[PDB]
Design a protein around this ligand. Structure first.
Ligand code: NFA
Length: 83
């Protein structure tokens, strides 16, 4: 069976809180409330699981979300890691 991969949101000190939130809404189809909570989870504990899915999908979403921050001049980082 294909291995599943966690998409992780990593904290940083520069990306605006609300920007992270709308990234989460747009790329991972979260509500505002859910988005804030995941954002805040990473904010407090250094990181947060966003979603767990098939590798290629996990990689694609992590990059899409990362690029949004990157092209905005933010160090916002979404990574993948196996479970
Ligand atoms: N602007 C700030 O104070 C960031 N801690 C907000 C943030 C949350 C989650 C990930 C990255 C950034």
């Amino acid at each position: 069976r294909p291995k599943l991969y966690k998409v992780m949101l990593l904290n940083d000190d520069y990306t605006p809180r609300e920007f992270v939130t709308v990234v989460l809404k747009a790329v991972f189809r979260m509500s505002e409330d859910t988005g804030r909570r995941v954002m805040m989870t990473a904010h407090r504990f250094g990181s947060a699981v966003v979603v767990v899915c098939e590798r290629d999908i996990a990689e694609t979403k992590a990059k899409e979300a990362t690029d949004l921050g990157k092209e905005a001049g933010f160090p916002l980082m979404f990574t993948t890691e196996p479970e």
